[PDB]
Design a protein around this ligand. Structure first.
Ligand SMILES: CCCCCCCCCCCCCCCCCC(=O)OC[C@H](CO[C@@H]1O[C@H](CO[C@H]2O[C@H](CO)[C@H](O)[C@H](O)[C@H]2O)[C@H](O)[C@H](O)[C@H]1O)OC(=O)CCCCCCCCCCCCCCCCC
Ligand code: CLA
Ligand code: CLA
Ligand code: CLA
Ligand code: CLA
Ligand SMILES: CC(C)=CCC/C(C)=C/CC/C(C)=C/CC/C(C)=C\CC/C(C)=C\CC/C(C)=C/CC/C(C)=C/CC/C(C)=C/CC/C(C)=C/CC1=CC(=O)C(C)=C(C)C1=O
Ligand SMILES: CCCCCCCCCCCCCCCCCC(=O)OC[C@H](CO[C@@H]1O[C@H](CO)[C@H](O)[C@H](O)[C@H]1O)OC(=O)CCCCCCCCCCCCCCCCC
Ligand SMILES: CCCCCCCCCCCCCCCC(=O)OC[C@H](CO[C@@H]1O[C@H](CS(=O)(=O)O)[C@@H](O)[C@H](O)[C@H]1O)OC(=O)CCCCCCCCCCCCCCC
Ligand SMILES: CCCCCCCCCCCCCCCC(=O)OC[C@H](COP(=O)(O)OC[C@@H](O)CO)OC(=O)CCCCCCCCCCCCCCC
Ligand SMILES: CCCCCCCCCCCCCCCC(=O)OC[C@H](COP(=O)(O)OC[C@@H](O)CO)OC(=O)CCCCCCCCCCCCCCC
Ligand SMILES: CC1=C(/C=C/C(C)=C/C=C/C(C)=C/C=C/C=C(C)/C=C/C=C(C)/C=C/C2=C(C)CCCC2(C)C)C(C)(C)CCC1
Ligand code: OEX
Ligand SMILES: [Cl-]
Ligand SMILES: [Cl-]
Lengths: 137, 243, 97, 101, 333, 102, 176, 200
């Protein structure tokens, strides 16, 4: 098995348009995920709220859907609850709360796209390990 | 006005607040104004366990016990609605608070009685024609006693109610009829009765204080054995605000 | 005589759908638009005589009522099991990932 | 003097007493075989060879006698499920008696 | 002067067992710890170790044998709080919360430290070189690590090692679950220390026994060829050196008895120092090596190693240990 | 769980102790679970919720600020637990977080 | 892989409970103790046979006299510990005897485990624990730990069995 | 019934214990009759097969798969998020042959108890009262014989080493020669080790 462009092909929007990430983009997304998110999102789970996770099905059932690149980038800019009824930027890292979350200060749009691409590609690589918790370790 | 650093380690945090000795007033109650218990504290001072005689008919009196779980027994921060009924009786319905404490008391002979000292979902009313809370007001009421262990508790062999094994796995071929009492955990919700006797009133600040006696059952170990009847005696304090 | 009530509840419709009176709130994650606001309202206002009484929760908006109508077929109502709802297990039943 | 773990070294240059010690050991082993067979015969239940065979009953020396051809008892039963079998002298009891003698 | 006579008696080398000033502290503390241990191991009521009102019975009278019996560590509700008898309202409360464990371990640790000091003291009174106490510092450091330092780092004496055989095994298994001690280099150095200590003990014993000079006949024990206090060496050091130098090669063999016995002292003592330090450093949660999901294929699939199998075993222990005591996802202490 | 509508004062854990709030042996209202051993902890993010009798239910219900929630989440996910090769978390954690506390 | 072997024997065989392994542990730890204590005792009862402050040069291999004082060592350990060796030959045979006997006992236990003849459980404790849900010992807790080891380790440790344990059948405690 | 009795893990000699003494019957009772073959079906009528217990496992979960190996039912440990419970899947058990021939059970406690028996292979009725059986497996005389003779063979390896050593080293049994030459054990003097005639 290799990191083929079919593996690195992920939804871009909710309409159905797709994008293909480069391996450098995927590796930079993994590095930035480990830098800014993995302390609470290691393995695709959420440490401080285990009932939600970063599985593609869970992101797809979110409001608005977060199973594409644009939805995940929008979440990184303006995070909300799962039903999209309240904004949670004061307790979740974001660009709009980069003053209280300093690790989000130097994140560019390309960094956000790479992080979103890593989040979307990791289940396709790891199977049930992504978001599975310690059962699948 | 004692800070936390004046209180920690001393045991005063388990004590209910006391009213002054020169305070035996009356707190007036308008039948239109709604009232609340902003703070109900219950500090138990004595646990009595009903003995189980061998014969079917005997005295069956309560015996004293020794507390072994230290100063972890008081219920505090209990809030509720104090409504006035059409008969003039005052009904207290609790909503939330630290309304339960697990307590283990040791009977003579070394046997330990665990119990969930609680006033969970207490509804307590007075006699009719109470227009002012005096030192003769009594609150008689009932509460729910849930199971001492909740449904996720695992016994030493890994059996439980909502989780765990359903059989004795270390005896894979033993007969299961004799072990059905230990294999099948049961959740019990019993009823308790409590009487709160008002002894001191502060008509200015709305505070009342007095003594309580409650009756409930002890832990049954998820239905493994029969519970013991426990009477709890102590003092109480209640802050009555106009809502 | 001695029966495990949780397994008996799994035998009912509690084991197939979301019971409005018994199920832990995290199960409301598995449908769109229920968690956490509508789920909090549903768990707060339980018990329910029937499923469609979830539309009569006080303070519901038109959007939330439409969301509940779209998930009406995913709900059941059974008798309130004491072991499932005591100890605050409808908000935290001790199960995480 | 001799340590305890060397007491039997007095037999090393005494062939007659070494033969006597070997004879005593052989007598002990044969007596064990006879008495073990007698104990097993006292405890064995031969009624159901299908679901209660000898290996379910902790029988240790009975299968060896059965292996070389001793299958019957003077009490009339056999391990193979037959009854009133007439096993002659060489039953389990006869083998045990021969070992004791 | 009564004080001069008492000082002469305390420091006297003519006593059958030397006391000394370290022994003046050591005898009452170790007597108290021993008496309380025997009484608690036979007759203590069950102890709520995890602080969750789930008492664990460890005494013989409450249904234990020698293997399963233990003095159960004090309650998790107590934590690191000092819990003497007079802090409890009654003896029943003190026994319920595991007070005997704190009494025994505090008296034992003080008495064993004074045992080390007493070893120095007697070596000084006899004109000996003083470093036997340094060798004894390795098991003493181990006892301090499992009874004091690990509770301090974890924040509760409930996480100290129970005073029993099966309680010790429980301590080992939960420790591997939480810290992966097998993958810690200090524990590996400790295993090298104890395996090498057993190896070099068997080696030195067999090499000295092999080269014993013939002093007795074939009937008697060879041990009667040595007389206590004799001046000559009872074995041929050169013959043992020749054997062991032909067994491997000449320069892997000690021809110096003093260097050999220093090596015999030094190898297990340094190894046990390192494993005691491993227990203490894991008490501050600096755990053994974590190689979970270290080997990754070209696509990104996890290729398991033996470390992943160890991780599966550790996960089983982790999710089953103290099965009712955890309310939250992370076992932070 | 309080944001989800739970009553944290009356919530009962598996053993019958309070899931979130219990009493220390001297009566103080403290956090439940295994962290009952750590009830002597004092920190600037926790002291605004402490009253004379320990943790106060009303200030828990009404006076928890977003900076305190941020601080609690950050300190929970940077616990001083890690491996010798600097893998953050418990010994059973996978290799993604490079953290050992100073 | 050897660490996996250790954890396998704990989870499946309860090898710590085995008395033959206990004798092996006693032999190995006693051998390490004897090694350390004999080396330290010899090094600290040395005779002064030179003027160097480092004493290793004060030994010549062809010398006839003992390099350390057996009498002083005997008196030291008689007053510290109560008992002491007085026979050097018996001391060194004992140093041979302890770890060798321990290793042989552990080998016997491993033969028993080859036939799955384990010291897994005490039957009296298990009958009591089955009938009494309040009876807990450290041994019963160890049995629960063994159940966890087996269930969580077996699908990957024994891939030929094709174990598919769903998440709901895995024994877990609360939370965690 | 004999053939079915062989297909039962209580007759496996690798299932006993070192100090679980006595006959195999004292383990699990005296076998009385075969209950017959248990066939498990879910509520859609598909046959389910109980995963048998290997000899390594003192305890084993109950897992029911179809013919293609896909897990279809189980007895869950945690029941809050159970999906494959016997109650959810409508698992029933029927018996063919034996005592329970033609009998079908639908009550989930009964079906679960029969599945817990079915992990041991064939299901049998036992008399646990005659010998006061504890319900804990014991090994056969095959296992006890193999254990005793493997242990004895190991100890006799030590005996062979000891007596061969005493045979070949009889002249030095009480000690080595007091006047052993220091130029007989040093390197360089002889050419062949321990041979005086090859001295340089
Ligand atoms: C048990 C321990 C007890 C505690 C004592 C620790 C204190 C001293 C630390 C050692 C000093 C040098 C450390 C070093 O340089 O450490 C740095 C490097 C690692 O570098 C970086 O280390 C980082 C980890 O550290 C830190 O950096 C991270 C940054 O993201 C995080 O902040 C994290 O929290 C933090 O820990 C990351 O892993 C980086 O990716 C990685 O590049 O350590 C390595 O791998 C080391 C490289 C090989 C070292 C070889 C040593 C060999 C043994 C010597 C002794 C021999 C025996 C003695 C007797 C002699 C004869 C027998
Ligand atoms: C007339 C002599 C005689 C006879 C016919 C029997 C007959 C019997 N004995 Mg017995 N026995 C005897 C004497 C005898 N015994 C003596 C003297 C002793 C005391 C030592 C015993 C001790 C004894 C015990 C302890 C037991 C029996 C048992 C038995 C029964 C099964 C035998 C079996 O499986 O053997 C198996 C025999 C062998 C496998 C022989 C092994 C031979 C080895 C391989 C020889 C190797 C060395 C050889 C010299 C190598 C060179 C060979 C060369 C040809 C190249 C059987 C009824 C068993 C029984 O059922 O008890 C009730 C049992 O447990 N016997
Ligand atoms: C206090 C802790 C402790 C101690 C002291 C021991 C002690 C022991 N355990 Mg043990 N154990 C423990 C805890 C402990 N255990 C726990 C908690 C568990 C989990 C249940 C186990 C599980 C366990 C298992 C599973 C086994 C042991 C075994 C043993 C024995 C090992 C003997 C040995 O040296 O084998 C080492 C190996 C040998 C001596 C064989 C010869 C090796 C040759 C000579 C090496 C040649 C090297 C050569 C020069 C090449 C080198 C190359 C180089 C590059 C490496 C010993 C008695 C083993 C046993 O009982 O054996 C019978 C065993 O199988 N233990
Ligand atoms: C080769 C030897 C051997 C074998 C394989 C068997 C096999 C059997 N016997 Mg048997 N038996 C034998 C010899 C043997 N026997 C002898 C010599 C006698 C006379 C004493 C008996 C007397 C006897 C009776 C009376 C009974 C049996 C029974 C049984 C059955 C049950 C086994 C059991 O409970 O074991 C249990 C085994 C153990 C608990 C193992 C003992 C472990 C020891 C104690 C280890 C010692 C360690 C040591 C002290 C370490 C020292 C260290 C030091 C050197 C440093 C089984 C078929 C029973 C049965 O079912 O019969 C119907 C029964 O009632 N046997
Ligand atoms: C055919 C087997 C056989 C025979 C004839 C001998 C014969 C002898 N051995 Mg030997 N040995 C054997 C097997 C055998 N051994 C095995 C298998 C081992 C390994 C364990 C040894 C290990 C051994 C050592 C280490 C030594 C001897 C010594 C001796 C000599 C003196 C024995 C003595 O006085 O003991 C007297 C014994 C006692 C008074 C009590 C022993 C009780 C034991 C420990 C426990 C109970 C055993 C039990 C009754 C046996 C049951 C039967 C069993 C075989 C199944 C003698 C020539 C000694 C020697 O060479 O002297 C110069 C010596 O030092 N043997
Ligand atoms: C009822 C109640 C209260 C119960 C108490 C609770 C409790 C749990 C107790 C039970 C304990 C128990 C079950 C123990 C089990 C032990 C166990 C596993 C069994 C033993 C195993 C065994 C039979 C075989 C293993 C192999 C073997 C032979 C081991 C022996 C180990 C052993 C004794 C080693 C020696 C240890 C030791 C301290 C030696 C000191 C030697 C010494 C005095 C040296 C001094 C010295 C050194 C010199 O260098 C010189 C020169 C001189 C001159 C000199 O003097
Ligand atoms: C002269 C006398 C010498 C001293 C005698 C006492 C010896 C010590 C006791 C040892 C056995 C104790 C076991 C527990 C007691 C018990 O219940 O047994 C009692 C058991 C019998 O078991 C009983 O059986 C009954 C039906 O017969 C019932 O089922 C009972 O419940 C059951 O207990 O006795 C035996 O099995 C004895 C025979 C043992 C054979 C073992 C073969 C393997 C041995 C290998 C040896 C290798 C060791 C190497 C060491 C280095
Ligand atoms: C449960 C609560 C109740 C507990 C009860 C405890 C009460 C203790 C009462 C003690 C009464 C005296 C008995 C001891 C006598 C004795 O030992 O004789 C030996 C000599 C006798 O006195 C020596 O001998 C001479 C006296 S005589 O002439 O021989 O009478 C004298 O000349 C010499 O100076 C003197 O040193 O004593 C000595 O050698 C010096 C004192 C050493 C005694 C220390 C005690 C051991 C402590 C070990 C701690 C751990 C133990 C754990 C168990 C393994
Ligand atoms: C750390 C120090 C290690 C040596 C001492 C520890 C053992 C003591 C045992 C009980 C006393 C035993 C006893 O009595 O020993 C005494 C022994 C000999 O004493 P001497 O009087 O001849 O010399 C010591 C001093 O007086 C110096 O002259 O001392 C030494 O050999 C000291 C060696 C120091 C060498 C410098 C340090 C080297 C460290 C080596 C380890 C590093 C590698 C480890 C890899 C993981
Ligand atoms: C602080 C006060 C110190 C005193 C504390 C108590 C110390 C007791 C030490 C043991 C005394 C009994 C020794 C008998 C044997 C005896 O008297 O031995 C005395 C013996 C003397 O040896 P010799 O060289 O004089 O022997 C001559 C030879 O020819 C032998 O034949 O010493 C040894 O062999 C030492 C090695 C044995 C190791 C024994 C120590 C074992 C520790 C205890 C184990 C307990 C397990 C169960 C506990 C419940
Ligand atoms: C403890 C045990 C053991 C051991 C055991 C043994 C070693 C035993 C032995 C046993 C034996 C060793 C037995 C024997 C017996 C014998 C007998 C019982 C005999 C008898 C005889 C008789 C009775 C005879 C008689 C007579 C005479 C004298 C002459 C004429 C003829 C007649 C016949 C009359 C072992 C280690 C294995 C294991 C564990 C347990
Ligand atoms: O106490 Mn004894 O072990 Ca140290 O981790 Mn947390 O706490 Mn409990 O769990 Mn895991
Ligand atoms: Cl545990
Ligand atoms: Cl917790």
């Amino acid at each position: 098995a290799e990191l083929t462009p079919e593996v690195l092909t992920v939804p871009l929007n909710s309409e159905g348009k797709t994008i293909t990430l480069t391996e450098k983009q995927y590796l930079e997304g993994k590095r930035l995920f480990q830098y800014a998110c993995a302390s609470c999102h290691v393995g695709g789970i959420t440490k401080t709220n285990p009932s939600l996770d970063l599985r593609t099905e869970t992101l797809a059932l979110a409001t608005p859907p977060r199973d594409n690149i644009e939805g995940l980038v929008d979440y990184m800019k303006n995070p909300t609850t799962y039903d999209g009824e309240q904004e949670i930027a004061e307790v979740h890292p974001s660009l709009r709360s980069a003053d209280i979350f300093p690790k989000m200060r130097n994140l560019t749009e390309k960094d956000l796209v790479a992080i979103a691409g890593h989040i979307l590609v990791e289940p396709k690589i790891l199977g049930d390990k992504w978001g599975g918790g310690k059962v699948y370790y | 006005t004692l800070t936390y650093d004046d209180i920690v380690g001393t045991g005063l945090a388990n004590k209910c607040p006391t009213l002054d000795d020169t305070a035996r007033g009356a707190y007036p109650i308008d039948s239109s104004q709604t009232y609340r218990i902003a703070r109900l504290c219950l500090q138990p001072t004595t646990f009595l366990v009903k003995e189980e005689p061998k014969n079917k008919r005997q005295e069956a009196e309560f015996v004293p016990t020794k507390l072994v779980t230290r100063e972890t027994t008081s219920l505090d921060q209990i809030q509720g609605e104090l409504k006035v009924n059409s008969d003039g009786s005052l009904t207290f319905v609790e909503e939330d608070g630290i309304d339960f404490q697990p307590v283990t008391v040791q009977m003579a002979g070394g046997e330990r009685i665990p119990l969930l000292f609680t006033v969970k979902n207490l509804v307590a009313s007075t006699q009719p024609n109470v227009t002012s809370i005096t030192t003769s007001t009594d609150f008689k009421g009932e509460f729910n006693v849930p199971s001492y262990r909740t449904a996720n508790f695992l016994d030493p062999k890994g059996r439980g109610l909502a989780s765990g094994y359903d059989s004795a796995i270390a005896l894979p071929q033993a007969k299961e009829e004799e072990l059905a009492r230990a294999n099948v955990k049961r959740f019990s919700l019993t009823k308790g009765q409590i009487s709160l006797n008002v002894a001191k009133v502060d008509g200015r600040t709305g505070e009342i204080a007095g003594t309580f006696e409650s009756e409930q059952l002890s832990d049954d170990d998820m239905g493994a054995h029969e519970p013991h009847e426990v009477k709890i005696q102590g003092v109480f304090y209640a802050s009555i605000e106009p809502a | 005589e001695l029966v495990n009530v949780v397994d008996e509840k799994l035998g009912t419709a509690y084991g197939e759908k979301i019971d409005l009176n018994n199920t832990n709130i995290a199960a409301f994650i598995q449908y769109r638009g229920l968690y956490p606001t509508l789920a909090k309202l549903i768990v707060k206002n339980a018990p329910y005589e029937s499923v469609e009484d979830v539309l009569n929760i006080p303070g519901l908006t038109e959007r939330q009522k439409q969301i509940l109508r779209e998930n009406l077929e995913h709900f059941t109502v059974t008798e309130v099991e004491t072991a499932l709802v005591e100890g605050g297990d409808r908000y935290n039943n001790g199960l995480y990932k | 003097g001799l340590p305890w773990y060397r007491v039997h070294t007095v037999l090393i240059n005494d062939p007659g007493r070494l033969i006597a010690a070997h004879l005593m050991h052989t007598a002990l082993v044969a007596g064990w075989a006879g008495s073990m067979a007698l104990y097993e015969l006292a405890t064995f239940d031969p009624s159901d060879p299908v679901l209660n065979p000898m290996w379910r009953q902790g029988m240790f020396v009975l299968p060896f006698m059965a292996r070389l051809g001793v299958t019957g008892s003077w009490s009339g039963w056999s391990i193979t499920g037959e009854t009133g079998i007439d096993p002659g002298f060489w039953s389990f009891e006869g083998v045990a008696l021969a070992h004791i003698v | 002067n009564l004080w001069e006579r008492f000082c002469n008696w305390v420091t006297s080398t003519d006593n059958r067992l030397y006391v000394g000033w370290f022994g003046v502290i050591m005898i009452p503390t170790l007597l108290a710890a021993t008496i309380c241990f025997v009484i608690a191991f036979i007759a203590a009521p069950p102890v709520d170790i995890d602080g969750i009102r789930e008492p664990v019975s460890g005494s013989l009278l409450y249904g234990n044998n020698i293997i399963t019996g233990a003095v159960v560590p004090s309650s998790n509700a107590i934590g690191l709080h000092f819990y003497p008898i007079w802090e409890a309202a009654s003896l029943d409360e003190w026994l319920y919360n595991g007070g005997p464990y704190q009494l025994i371990i505090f008296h034992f640790l003080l008495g064993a430290s004074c045992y080390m000091g007493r070893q120095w003291e007697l070596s000084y009174r006899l004109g000996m070189r003083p470093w036997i106490c340094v060798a004894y510092s390795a098991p003493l450091a181990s006892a301090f690590a499992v009874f004091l330092i690990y509770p301090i780092g974890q924040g509760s004496f409930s996480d100290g090692m129970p005073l029993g055989i099966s309680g010790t095994f429980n301590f080992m298994i939960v420790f591997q679950a939480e810290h992966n001690i097998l993958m810690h280099p200090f524990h590996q150095l400790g295993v090298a220390g104890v395996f090498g200590g057993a190896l070099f003990c068997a080696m030195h014993g067999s090499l000295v026994t092999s080269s014993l000079i013939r002093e007795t006949t074939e009937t008697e024990s060879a041990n009667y060829g040595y007389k206590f206090g004799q001046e000559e060496e009872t074995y041929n050091i050169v013959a043992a050196h020749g054997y062991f130098g032909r067994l491997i090669f000449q320069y892997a063999s000690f021809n110096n008895s003093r260097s050999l016995h220093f090596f015999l002292a030094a190898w297990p003592v340094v190894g046990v120092w390192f494993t005691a330090l491993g227990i203490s450093t894991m008490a501050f949660n600096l755990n053994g090596f974590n190689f979970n999901h270290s080997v990754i294929d070209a696509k990104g699939n996890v290729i398991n190693t033996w470390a992943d199998i160890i991780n599966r075993a550790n996960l089983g222990m982790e999710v089953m240990h103290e099965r009712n005591a955890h309310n939250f996802p992370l076992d932070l202490a | 769980d309080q944001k989800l509508g739970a009553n944290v004062g009356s919530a009962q854990g598996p053993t019958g102790l309070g899931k979130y709030l219990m009493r220390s042996p001297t009566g103080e209202i403290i956090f439940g679970g295994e962290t009952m051993r750590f009830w002597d902890f004092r920190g600037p993010w926790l002291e605004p919720l402490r009253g004379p009798n320990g943790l106060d239910l009303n200030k828990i219900k009404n006076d928890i600020q977003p900076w305190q929630e941020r601080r609690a989440a950050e300190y929970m996910t940077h616990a001083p637990l890690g491996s010798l090769n600097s893998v953050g978390g418990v010994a059973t954690e996978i290799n993604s977080v490079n953290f050992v506390s100073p | 892989a050897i660490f996996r072997f250790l954890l396998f024997f704990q989870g499946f065989h309860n090898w710590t409970l085995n008395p033959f392994h206990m004798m092996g542990v006693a032999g190995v730890l006693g051998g390490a103790l004897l090694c350390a204590i004999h080396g330290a005792t010899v090094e600290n009862t040395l005779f002064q046979d030179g003027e160097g402050a480092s004493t290793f040069r004060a030994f010549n291999p062809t010398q006839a006299e003992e390099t350390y004082s057996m009498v002083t060592a005997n008196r030291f350990w008689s007053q510290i510990f109560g008992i002491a060796f007085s026979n050097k030959r018996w001391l060194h045979f004992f140093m041979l005897f302890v770890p060798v006997t321990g290793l042989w006992m552990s080998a016997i236990g491993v033969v028993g485990l080859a036939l799955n003849l384990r010291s897994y459980d005490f039957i009296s404790q298990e009958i009591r624990a089955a009938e009494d849900p309040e009876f807990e010992t450290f041994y019963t807790k160890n049995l629960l730990l063994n159940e966890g080891i087996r269930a969580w380790m077996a699908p990957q440790d024994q891939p030929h069995e094709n174990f598919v344990f769903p998440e709901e059948v895995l024994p877990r405690g609360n939370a965690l | 019934e004999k053939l079915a009795f062989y297909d039962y893990i209580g007759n496996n000699p690798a299932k006993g214990g070192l100090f679980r003494t006595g006959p195999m019957n004292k383990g699990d009772g005296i076998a009385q009759a075969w209950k017959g073959h248990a066939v498990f079906r879910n509520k859609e009528g598909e046959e389910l097969f109980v995963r048998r217990m290997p000899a390594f496992f003192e305890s084993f979960p109950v897992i029911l798969t179809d013919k293609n190996g896909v897990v279809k039912a189980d007895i869950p440990f945690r029941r809050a998020e159970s999906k494959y419970s016997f109650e959810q899947q409508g698992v029933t058990v029927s018996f063919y042959g034996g005592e329970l021939n033609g009998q079908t059970f639908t009550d989930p406690p009964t079906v679960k108890s029969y599945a817990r028996k079915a992990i041991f292979g064939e299901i049998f009725e036992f008399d646990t009262e005659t010998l006061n059986s504890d319900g804990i497996f014991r090994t056969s005389p095959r296992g006890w014989f193999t254990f005793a003779h493997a242990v004895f063979a190991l100890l006799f390896f030590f005996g062979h080493i000891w007596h061969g050593a005493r045979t070949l080293f009889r002249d030095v049994f009480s000690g080595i020669d007091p006047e052993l030459s220091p130029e007989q054990v040093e390197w360089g003097f002889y050419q062949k080790v321990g041979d005086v005639t090859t001295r340089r």
